[PDB]
Amino acid sequence: DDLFGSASWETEEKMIKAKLITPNNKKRAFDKREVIVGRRGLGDFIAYAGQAFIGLIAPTRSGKGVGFIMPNMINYPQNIVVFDPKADTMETCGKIREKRFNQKVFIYEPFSLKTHRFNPFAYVDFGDFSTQIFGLAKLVFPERKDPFFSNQARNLFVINCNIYRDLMWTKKGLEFVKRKKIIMPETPTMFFIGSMSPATRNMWNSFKTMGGARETYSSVQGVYTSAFAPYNNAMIRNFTSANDFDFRRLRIDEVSIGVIANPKESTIVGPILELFFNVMIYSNLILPIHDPQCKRSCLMLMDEFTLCGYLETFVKAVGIMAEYNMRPAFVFQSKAQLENDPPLGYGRNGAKTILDNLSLNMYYGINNDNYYEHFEKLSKVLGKYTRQDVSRSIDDNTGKTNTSISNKERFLMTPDELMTMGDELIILENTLKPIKCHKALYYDDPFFTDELIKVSPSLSKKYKLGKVPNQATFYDDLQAAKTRGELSYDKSLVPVGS
Amino acid sequence: VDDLFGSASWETEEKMIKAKLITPNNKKRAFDKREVIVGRRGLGDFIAYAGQAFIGLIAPTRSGKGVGFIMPNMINYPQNIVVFDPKADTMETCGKIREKRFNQKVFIYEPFSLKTHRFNPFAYVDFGDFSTQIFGLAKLVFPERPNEKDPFFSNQARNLFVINCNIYRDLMWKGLEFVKRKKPETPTMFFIGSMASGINVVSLMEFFGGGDNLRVLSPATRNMWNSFKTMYSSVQGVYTSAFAPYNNAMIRNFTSANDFDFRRLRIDEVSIGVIANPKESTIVGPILELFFNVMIYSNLILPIHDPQCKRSCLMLMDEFTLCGYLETFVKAVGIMAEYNMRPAFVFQSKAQLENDPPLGYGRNGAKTILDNLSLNMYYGINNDNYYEHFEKLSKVLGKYTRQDVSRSIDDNTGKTNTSISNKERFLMTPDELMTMGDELIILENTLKPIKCHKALYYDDPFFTDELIKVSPSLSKKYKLGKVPNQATFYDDLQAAKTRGELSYDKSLVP
Amino acid sequence: DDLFGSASWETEEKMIKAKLITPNNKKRAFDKREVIVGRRGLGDFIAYAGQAFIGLIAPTRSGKGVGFIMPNMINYPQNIVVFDPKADTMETCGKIREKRFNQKVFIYEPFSLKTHRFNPFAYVDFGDFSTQIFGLAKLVFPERPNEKDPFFSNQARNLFVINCNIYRDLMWTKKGLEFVKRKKIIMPETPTMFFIGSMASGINLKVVSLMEFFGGEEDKSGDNLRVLSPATRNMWNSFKTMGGARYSSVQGVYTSAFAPYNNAMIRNFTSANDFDFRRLRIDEVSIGVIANPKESTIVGPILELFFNVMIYSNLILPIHDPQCKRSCLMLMDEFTLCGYLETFVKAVGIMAEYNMRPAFVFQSKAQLENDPPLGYGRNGAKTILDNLSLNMYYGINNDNYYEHFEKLSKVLGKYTRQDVSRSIDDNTGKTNTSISNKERFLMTPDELMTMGDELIILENTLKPIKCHKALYYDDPFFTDELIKVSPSLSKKYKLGKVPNQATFYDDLQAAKTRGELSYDKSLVPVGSSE
């Protein structure tokens, strides 16, 4: 009966048809670039294939790292770009990325000398020219009681880059600079642009265009400098000092990219991460049919996504990124933090645009009164099924009994039941009925601890491969081995600046 | 038939027949009312919207908007179509169908490719209507500024465009006397982008004009410049920034000439595909704005005023939110219906439509567009972010009366008792709508809710028959009239698209 | 029993007592200026008498024209002021208004040269004056809730009034005419808004500034200041102490307040005043306003004046003047399209006893509650809605309107129904029947959304009414008047019979394109810019 609802968990057959599991799931090949989202037991995983996007609504300290980030870091066989704010994911899985999958590891730490460098001017064709320049200016000066001037500063950056362009990629400009009057580089950086032929005739007309420098140079220059100020920092200047990896090969070479950043601790790094992700996403709108070399997939483990702030590039790109095998999995504390106003959010409709492009959503549960509303909604989303309710009557004189059966409604999962799942989680796929499963714990499964023990001598002496490690001492020995860099990526290839 | 708990019910067959969505013999329906397929009740048993009202399809991702709505009407619609094809699959799959089935000329506008087509907004002027055209394009190129650094510049740049167009009509018409002064006549965008430096760079207040050319150029042709000399560098900068996208060879080739007369969009049997991804290339925004402006406004004449414009044209606005800010549709959907310009908008959610005007249409613009959709299709997906959307939909379907049975046993003996009662039940609960799968809900403004199946094209031989009889690679493997094998039809169709044998006439496009 | 509710539909009794219907309703005389709002059958109408105001909450494409506007356009025997943004209502009922009611038809299309003109300065007695001038100034220069810098708008309004006093003391004085003739001052007779705005640059001779012509370097002898009145001179001194020191920002906002009048169409529409709005309740006239403020914000303020002067020119009791016995039904069709018109918010509560009877037609209560830019604000929307005593509600099956109908469902209330349950011994076959009482919505939300061509009428002093739309195209009560007017409709369709429903609307559009159902356009003045 369905009078009081028809809610139900998804069947094993439909999950097989959706390719989430296989008939012999414990012996599955993992040959469809699948992302592990849950487990039915040790080595019996639920994994998402295809190109659809994953959302993980994980409260603070709910186990997103040990149940999603670390398992896929250890298992996923294609390219990975992971957000690593605590500098622990890469420190734990880099040796696996390099030894098991044979992938070069690039670490982008803008607030440290030891980092790989990214320069956006390495992605322009100095010699659709000015399109990249205008997009870069839009990134440098964001669109927003004080209009104009900022647009004049964007024009200042426009003909700034145009001036440096004319200064090098011209045959006479080479001699003009060979007069030894300026010290411009061979390839420009953002700091250098900030410190600074009929198209150049129009550029001179722009040098006398709206008169932005006539009795109004002070304010325009002040806004320009307030925008270019992040590059007065030595760490940021070193981060933009060069470009070590070409993002146009993110789907060609076998690479793993970690980003160690924190814009909440310092609002300065915001625009640099914005530029970084914009160039990374916009360097791969080439279909594998048009470029047969771009065959690999790039899983983007956007851990601590809401900590990144407003990245409008994602809002504009999520709806078209899927077919290019740029597959992000967003992990945010809660939806409420996502919809917030631009400064620390994406707006209501922008967050809705991002969330509409997620086809698999994992829901962890914690018993916190601050997450009630959310979980309540989740309860209502799972719907109700029909249940039998038994009542009894007894004649107090004779003692005979009467049993009555009626139908009632029951939530598939009540709010407090959702809040007290512990290590269980709910999976909602767009085309499937709700699923309940266990977190793919990495430290509990030999499926991942074997890979962790393989590449480390200490764990190899302590624990045997294939056996579940002694839970009372495994994590501590893993930490002790991480202190000596046994699990970390080889840090000798990470460049160091002055 | 009890309405004690509401009277919610699906629309009856009789009322659907009266609404021309189906016929008394729907399997043998002739499709003679220019109907748009919006779902099926079975193999070849389709529900089809007649009339002139507009369709809206709220189809999320991984929902089958193309395979359930775009592809079937592409195979089936007998009149003219204008499809938005950003992924290059719809046209590359149905072009040979539009060509061979309905004898229609396929015209593909892919600005970012050599094999493209050409659109010149200048071929739409009365070479009393030339001044009207000048004012029209001046309004279409200079929009109203609610908050600018100054509205005076906006109005003055509109007036500068108008006066420059008047002077250009003056010089290009005794137009041959000045031709013999120096060493094309059909204007293009970035050659009009040079219409601010000079004849080639003469001064913007001298040259051979105003001197004393108030009478050399017919009254107002050189008179407005005498009055607008107060009420050049920044003006040239703004004009060059406006015309700069034309400097790209792609857009340059797009606006180099014109191979189609949009005033004949309802005359000749044609099919217009548009390949564009403004989310990737953000520069095509204003360009597509002018494109659709001239495509729609050049068709705003009633068929009673010109019966030669007899054909209808369905605008399959697939990925409508992708187009960006197309204020044409915001200002036009309220009057287009009576002109046989019939759009069907396809979008992922209401929120994506309500996005801010730069990347969406705004709340008020989204409401203005949604208010002109009389038939609304609802595909279901099990996504928490859509709960509020489907719950309301559930509430819109209503409640009906159902029977509730309670049994009671006398344990000492075993004799039983059955008791029935009436209870309320939502016609469809929110979580039931969320898990419809291949089903969908149609809401027509003047009808009761309709539930049906998605009109899939690979499922039904109603469409695979055409796709097979058209391409030679599929005719050998599969036969007509029979539903082909589901395990190998899609891959064979992919492979047929690889060879282009199921595409269209690529040789024609410039 | 009323334990679970007592909601019910109004009986034929109370409707008769409310004068909404009569005993011989089919043969009703229509002698109490009634507005048709519904029907219980072909030619069996529900019609509102009295002076109360009507509201029609009709979603888009829900039949407000065919069910309300066009029926009363055909039937209403008194004066009609209709809003016709699509120019279709007039095009369909003009010759009915003219031939059946002998009413002169005026057309106000501020974007077609074929239009009648309106000039607010024609409603001012120059040679009382201060009150009307200040009212017109507050109309052109309205208050702002921003309050961050209202002094500039105040001084711009002071400049407007001052310019008006200067014009009055120059063109309606005795020595001012001699002064203008001696110094060759370009100044027209009856003033227009365009000229009052152009006076910001200065007095036309070229043109020199006001600060120069009066008390400046151009007025060396000081004679040009003496020609003005002492009150105007004191106001000019006060303004020179106000804006004239440290004016540059006042002239900008002043010239911006007259920017719509740099347009040629608005210039022609303002140049004259064809119809006297003080005659709206004496002569038999029918006025059609063809504008669209959403298509162009320029006509926004113009309409604001146009309607305002129309209302306040008709605030006279019939005991003051016995010529004002004619009522004026104001078919405010597509009301929110007119944007924010303060005159309606301020005047809905006072224009009822003047026989200015508006019927507001809007798509939803939420769109009317929109903020001043595109609506009236919550408080203003409530103010307008509080003065509507008969509200018609159309239904459509559209989720965007669900919250509107749920509430309406709740407004209709619940009633008590009987519910039967059955039991049965599964062995002996003996059964049991039980009856209880339950509650039932008079109309569930989905029932209202699927009402089709039925509607709900809520009158302030009655119980809910459910009736059928007063469709004109299927009722000989209206098609008789529409076929009596067109020769070919008379050649095809017979009077007193329901026309062929498959072809009547199409043949009607055909006859309309030939202008047979339209007003005589020969009497509409035509201008030209030169």
Residue numbers in the entry:
A (entry chain B): 181 to 307, 335 to 351, 355 to 406, 444 to 745
B (entry chain C): 180 to 306, 334 to 379, 382 to 391, 395 to 411, 422 to 431, 437 to 457, 464 to 742
C (entry chain D): 181 to 307, 335 to 412, 421 to 461, 464 to 747
Question: What did the authors write?
Answer:
CagA is recruited to Cag T4SS by the Cagβ ATPase. CagZ, a unique protein in H. pylori, regulates Cagβ-mediated CagA transport, but the underlying mechanisms remain unclear.
We crystallized the soluble region of Cagβ (residues 166–748; referred to as Cagβ1) and collected an X-ray diffraction dataset to 2.8 Å resolution. Molecular replacement using this model found all six protomers in the asymmetric unit of the crystal, which together form a pseudo-6-fold symmetric hexameric assembly. Residues 631–658, an extended segment between two α-helices in the NBD, form two long anti-parallel β-strands that stray away from the NBD and constitute the bottom layer of the 3-layered Cagβ. These extended β-strands from the six subunits together form a 12-stranded β-barrel, contributing to the hexameric assembly. As in other hexameric ATPases, the NBD makes a major contribution to the inter-subunit interface for the formation of the hexamer, resulting in the placement of the ATP-binding site at the inter-subunit interface. The asymmetry in the Cagβ hexamer structure may reflect its intrinsic dynamic nature and ability to carry out sequential translocation of CagA through the channel at the middle of the hexamer. The central channel in the Cagβ hexamer runs continuously from the cytosol end to the membrane-proximal end, spanning a distance of ~100 Å. Our structure of the Cagβ hexamer shows that no arginine residue from the neighboring subunit is present near the ATP-binding site of the NBD, suggesting R241 in the Walker A motif may fulfill the role of the arginine finger in cis.
